[PDB]
RNA sequence: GUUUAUUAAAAACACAGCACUGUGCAAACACGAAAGUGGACGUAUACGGUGUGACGCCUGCCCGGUGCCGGAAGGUUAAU
RNA sequence: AGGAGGUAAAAUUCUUCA
RNA sequence: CUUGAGUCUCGUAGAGGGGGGUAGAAUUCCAGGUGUAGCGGUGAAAUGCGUAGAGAUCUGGAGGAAUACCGGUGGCGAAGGCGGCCCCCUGGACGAAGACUGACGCUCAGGUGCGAAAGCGUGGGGAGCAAACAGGAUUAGAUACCCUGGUAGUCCACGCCGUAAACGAUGUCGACUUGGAGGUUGUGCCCUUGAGGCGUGGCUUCCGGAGCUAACGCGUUAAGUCGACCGCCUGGGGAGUAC
């Protein structure tokens, strides 16, 4: 579930510094990472429903996180969607 | 199961079966398959194992 | 014909009939005898005595080979499971080994159902 | 791969294509081709011995080797081709010597495999070797009845044989028909199954879909007249006769097997 | 890169080739910067039941810290090699030593 | 008990027929029971502990 | 689509499909006193005969007579 | 005393309102 | 802003799910050797099977499916549901401290997805079991219970069906409320000096309080005491039917 190497790596790219993984940008970032990783996981098998709700839960999670960030600071929202690459 | 008697006797003395196989696990897988029904049986007997 | 001394007593007692067959140390069967073959039809052979006389029946047909001693491999529960080996010993056979070979599958095939009585 | 065409027109909605992507597209191997004309169900006397034979699309023969004498000489499957003459697919294999030959492409065959024949060939699909060296139970196709002749058993698509006996210098094979015929182990064979198996999943779709194949319309004995067929002509869908051939031969159970020569090579008839 | 028990048994007839197996095996592992903390060869030991005919086989314990890659393509070599009879890789939980 | 290779410790937790002895007799612990059983299952496969005495 | 060329073009025939049955290769069958050939330079997902007639829902009850597929104590029984 | 195994073959129906 | 709700580091347990292999036993089929009139079955028999040699017995091989013992009011998941062993991939949950984000929360019509068994479509496979069906018994009648056979099905790939006593017949989440006996999973402390001793969390099982209820019972996991939101009921039959 996302190596600790990538996790700590992402945290040091969105948040002001380390240990700041709580930041909204960090979460939505580490979440999308898996959504893209598992994205290929489901590309195969395609019969894994139990683990499917999990991926959906992850997206539905960041989704609500986006509305929140977009609610507070709008700038931080755009600078996130264009960077992370999503929303279309 | 198996028995290798000594010499001074001919009597069976093979009462080992009445403590393992014989019918302790044979009679069980003999009739109906039960499946989920056993749970109620064991639960009923386990409820009488208290007093 | 022939003249062996060591053989095997493959008995198969069930809830209906008990078959006893005395073979050699190679497993080729020298002579057999059923509880039903010696009469006793229905519940008549579904008894321990039916197997008792049955063993004596197989005995009085295999002794022609001079069978002194022989092993005994029991198979199948039901009556005539103990009384069977109790006959060969009294018949004059030197009992040596007694192992059980009752087919016990590790849960594979599906058993019948129809038995509502 | 099976495909079910859509009802774009009558006689096309009941069609079920059976294409294969891993199948070569183009002209076959010329060096292994010949004339192979079409008779028409007639013999040298020009008499139609076998009825229902005519028309059909022009076909060509494919030099296929069923003997597989190239022992101790590995070979690589270049590709898979379509053999109209048969119902199975042929495989143009290339040995290490530079010689190419056609063989009944087994089920688990692909382009780039290493097959070989001989009493040393590894037990795998695509290899040929005497049944005397092939383990019992091993599913084998294209079995021979005589050492040196050639595979004659299980040559169609999806068909296969299974060795299930030895004893002496012979072995009992479980024919796909359900019959167990005895054949001397001295006869070679090819492990694995034959070609495709979707050949029986076909349904044509229309009448014309059977004409260009080599089959002609079928006439009933009840429709014909008594002077032509024993079933008489009748005067409004009538019969009253016994199901027989247009030559006076009982059918629907009436067995017509007379050999007594190979009956010994038989263990248990089909069922 | 995790640990793997690995405990196969070679046919008693191919016991002279066994000492060679460990060579290529350990080599293929070390080739990918693999590891190795234990390697035992109990030798021709008694069997519990007549497996694939013949009695008594040649056991060869193992313990390597190879990645979940070179290890996956290891069984393919065992299955292809009719010499070896059984084969089994178990858990990981760090590494061990001696014992047995 | 804490391993399967230690057959010298799992040989006294199984009956003569090979059947795993329950915690009712061995008086073994909880978490240690399944682990003990899990170890036997592994040994049996490796031809370390006969499944039955018929052999 | 086919058919009574030249009074009948139709509900007839054919038809893909489905089913039963025969067939293990020197196949069954067919043309032939025979040889031989066709079937097929194919091999049961093949081939021949029969029946019905896309498809959809289904295809029941009955084995005496007449046939077919087997077994068989006794009885009758040709040539020799 | 605790545990395990074994141990039964079929036999319909009875108006309505109090 | 941090106590709700999450993230992060490390670690732990599990028939959770999916995919690919594997081993043993038994049954069936098949082959060889030996052997011979019985075998098989039932309450009693019979149909069936057998002189082309069964059953029984010995050896070997193939195939399908399910994993005895372990195994237990034991474990996991939202529910349905889920049991050999091993590898690969993967969801969620939980605990020891500290740090970080800072209500980013709960629920939720529509809609969407998943969803035992049975059934259906396109194929494969098919040991056993087994609707329909066939042939024997029972019976006043037996289109059933019983026995001998046996197709679909059960299995597998893909695409549908989305139906159940799909229940704990109790929707989900949060807070509060006397306890006792067990199961199961972490963790702190102590001559680890007893296989333990002394505490603290998550989850689960039975009993039992107040209380609640028509009663049965439930009873810190409530049907108790409150709060938020969604669904649903208004006599039975008609009917979970008609349009």
From Swiss-Prot, chain A:
Keywords associated with the record: Ribonucleoprotein, Ribosomal protein, RNA-binding, rRNA-binding, Translation regulation
Highest taxon of the lineage: Bacteria
GO aspect biological process, one term: translation
GO molecular function, one term: structural constituent of ribosome
Protein function: One of the primary rRNA binding proteins, it binds directly to 16S rRNA where it helps nucleate assembly of the platform of the 30S subunit by binding and bridging several RNA helices of the 16S rRNA. Binds to its own mRNA, stabilizing it 5-UTR and preventing its translation. In the E.coli 70S ribosome it has been modeled to contact the 23S rRNA of the 50S subunit forming part of bridge B4. In the two 3.5 A resolved ribosome structures there are minor differences between side-chain conformations.
Family, similarity comment: Belongs to the universal ribosomal protein uS15 family.
UniProt-recorded name of the protein: Small ribosomal subunit protein uS15
From Swiss-Prot, chain D:
InterPro entries attached to this UniProt entry: NA-bd_OB-fold, Rib_uL2_dom2, Ribosomal_uL2, Ribosomal_uL2_bac/org-type, Ribosomal_uL2_C, Ribosomal_uL2_CS, Ribosomal_uL2_dom3, Ribosomal_uL2_RNA-bd_dom
A GO term from the CC aspect: cytoplasm
GO biological process, one term: negative regulation of DNA-templated DNA replication initiation
Gene3D superfamilies on file: 2.30.30.30, Nucleic acid-binding proteins, Ribosomal protein L2, domain 3
Modified residues (N6-acetyllysine): 241
Biased composition (Low complexity): 38-47
Keywords from the named record: Acetylation, Ribonucleoprotein, Ribosomal protein, RNA-binding, rRNA-binding
Matching Pfam families: Ribosomal_L2, Ribosomal_L2_C
Domain of life of the source: Bacteria
GO MF: RNA binding; rRNA binding; structural constituent of ribosome; transferase activity; zinc ion binding
Region feature Disordered, mapped onto this chain: 27-52, 220-271
Role this protein plays: One of the primary rRNA binding proteins. Located near the base of the L1 stalk, it is probably also mobile. Required for association of the 30S and 50S subunits to form the 70S ribosome, for tRNA binding and peptide bond formation. It has been suggested to have peptidyltransferase activity; this is highly controversial. In the E.coli 70S ribosome in the initiation state it has been modeled to make several contacts with the 16S rRNA (forming bridge B7b, PubMed:12809609); these contacts are broken in the model with bound EF-G.
Sequence similarity: Belongs to the universal ribosomal protein uL2 family.
Note: This protein can be partially replaced in vivo by its H.marismortui (HmaL2) or human (L8, from the 60S cytoplasmic ribosome) homolog.
From Swiss-Prot, chain E:
rRNA-binding keyword on record: yes
N6-acetyllysine PTM positions: 93
PTM (free text): 5 different forms of the protein, varying only in the number of C-terminal glutamate residues, were isolated. The sequence shown is form bS6-6, which is the longest. The first two Glu are encoded by the rpsF gene, the other Glu are added post-translationally by the RimK enzyme.
Entry keywords, A to Z: Acetylation, Ribonucleoprotein, Ribosomal protein, RNA-binding, rRNA-binding
Domain of life: Bacteria
Molecular-function annotations in GO: mRNA 5'-UTR binding; small ribosomal subunit rRNA binding; structural constituent of ribosome
GO cellular component terms, A-Z: cytoplasm; cytosol; cytosolic small ribosomal subunit
GO BP of this protein: cytoplasmic translation
Role of this protein: Binds together with bS18 to 16S ribosomal RNA.
Entry's family note: Belongs to the bacterial ribosomal protein bS6 family.
SUBUNIT field: Part of the 30S ribosomal subunit. Interacts weakly with uL2 in one of the 3.5 A resolved structures.
Protein name: Small ribosomal subunit protein bS6
Organism: Escherichia coli (strain K12)
Residues of the full protein shown: 1 to 100 of 135
Curated annotation (Swiss-Prot), chain F:
GO biological process terms held by the UniProt record: cytoplasmic translation; translation
Entry's Gene Ontology cellular component terms: cytoplasm; cytosol; cytosolic small ribosomal subunit
Molecular functions per Gene Ontology: mRNA 5'-UTR binding; small ribosomal subunit rRNA binding; structural constituent of ribosome
Keywords of the record: Acetylation, Ribonucleoprotein, Ribosomal protein, RNA-binding, rRNA-binding
Role according to the record: Binds as a heterodimer with protein bS6 to the central domain of the 16S rRNA, where it helps stabilize the platform of the 30S subunit.
Oligomeric and partner information: Part of the 30S ribosomal subunit. Forms a tight heterodimer with protein bS6.
Family per similarity comment: Belongs to the bacterial ribosomal protein bS18 family.
Protein name: Small ribosomal subunit protein bS18
Organism: Escherichia coli (strain K12)
Encoding gene (name): rpsR
Residues of the full protein shown: 20 to 74 of 75
């Amino acid at each position: 579930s996302l190596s600790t190497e990538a996790t700590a790596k992402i945290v040091s790219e969105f948040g002001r510094d380390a240990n700041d993984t709580g930041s909204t940008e960090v979460q939505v970032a580490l979440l999308t990472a898996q959504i893209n990783h598992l994205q290929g996981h489901f590309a195969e098998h395609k019969k894994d429903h139990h683990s499917r709700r999990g991926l959906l839960r992850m997206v539905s999670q960041r989704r609500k996180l986006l509305d929140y960030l977009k609610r507070k600071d709008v700038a931080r929202y755009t600078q996130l969607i264009e960077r992370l690459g999503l929303r279309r | 199961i198996k028995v290798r008697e000594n010499e001074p006797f001919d009597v069976a003395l093979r009462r080992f079966k009445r403590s393992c196989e014989k019918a302790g696990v044979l009679a069980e897988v003999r009739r109906r398959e039960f499946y989920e029904k056993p749970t109620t049986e064991r639960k009923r007997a386990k409820a009488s194992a208290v007093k | 014909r022939k003249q062996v001394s060591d053989g095997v007593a493959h008995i198969h007692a069930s809830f209906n009939n008990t078959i006893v067959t005395i073979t050699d140390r190679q497993g080729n069967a020298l002579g057999w005898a059923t509880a039903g073959g010696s009469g006793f039809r229905g519940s008549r052979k579904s008894t321990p005595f039916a197997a008792q006389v049955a063993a004596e029946r197989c005995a009085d047909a295999v002794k022609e080979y001079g069978i002194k001693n022989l092993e005994v491999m029991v198979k199948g529960p039901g009556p005539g499971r103990e009384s069977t080996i109790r006959a060969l010993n009294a018949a004059g056979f030197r009992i040596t080994n007694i192992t059980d070979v009752t087919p016990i599958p590790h849960n594979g095939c599906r058993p019948p159902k129809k038995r509502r009585v | 791969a099976v495909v079910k065409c859509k009802p774009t027109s009558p006689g096309r909605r009941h069609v079920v294509k059976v294409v294969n992507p891993e199948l070569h597209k183009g002209k076959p191997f010329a060096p292994l081709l010949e004339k192979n004309s079409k008779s028409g169900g007639r013999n040298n006397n020009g008499r139609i011995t076998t009825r229902h034979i005519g028309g059909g699309h022009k076909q060509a023969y494919r030099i296929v080797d069923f003997k597989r004498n190239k022992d101790g000489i590995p070979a690589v499957v270049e590709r898979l081709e379509y053999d109209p003459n048969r119902s199975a697919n042929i495989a143009l294999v290339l040995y290490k010597d530079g010689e190419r030959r056609y063989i009944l492409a087994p089920k688990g065959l692909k382009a780039g495999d290493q097959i070989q024949s001989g009493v040393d060939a590894a037990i795998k699909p695509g290899n040929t070797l005497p049944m005397r060296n092939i383990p019992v139970g091993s599913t084998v196709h294209n079995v021979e009845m005589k050492p040196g002749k050639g595979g004659q058993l299980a040559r169609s698509a999806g068909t296969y044989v299974q060795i299930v006996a030895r004893d002496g210098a012979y072995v009992t094979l479980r024919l796909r028909s359900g019959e167990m015929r005895k054949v001397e182990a001295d006869c070679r064979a090819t492990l694995g199954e034959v070609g495709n198996a979707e050949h029986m999943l076909r349904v044509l779709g229309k009448a014309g879909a059977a004409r260009w194949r080599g089959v002609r319309p079928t006439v009933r004995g009840t429709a014909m007249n008594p002077v032509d067929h024993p079933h008489g002509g009748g005067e409004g869908r009538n019969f009253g006769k016994h199901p027989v051939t247009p030559w006076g031969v009982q059918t629907k159970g009436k067995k017509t097997r007379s050999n007594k020569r190979t009956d010994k090579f038989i263990v248990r008839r089909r069922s | 890169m995790r640990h793997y028990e690995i405990v196969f048994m070679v046919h008693p007839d191919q016991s002279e080739q066994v000492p060679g197996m460990i060579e290529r095996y350990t080599a293929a592992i070390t080739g990918a910067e693999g590891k190795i903390h234990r390697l035992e060869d109990w030798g021709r030991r008694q069997l519990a039941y007549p497996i694939n005919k013949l009695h008594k086989a040649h056991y060869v314990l193992m313990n390597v810290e190879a990645p979940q890659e070179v290890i996956d393509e290891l069984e393919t070599t065992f299955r292809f090699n009719d010499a070896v009879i059984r084969s089994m890789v178990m858990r990981t939980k760090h590494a061990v030593t001696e014992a047995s | 008990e804490i391993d399967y290779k230690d057959i010298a410790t799992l040989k006294n937790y199984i009956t003569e027929s090979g059947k795993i002895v329950p915690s009712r007799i061995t008086g073994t612990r909880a978490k240690y029971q399944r682990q003990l059983a899990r170890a036997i299952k592994r040994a049996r496969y490796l031809s370390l502990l006969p499944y039955t005495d018929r052999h």
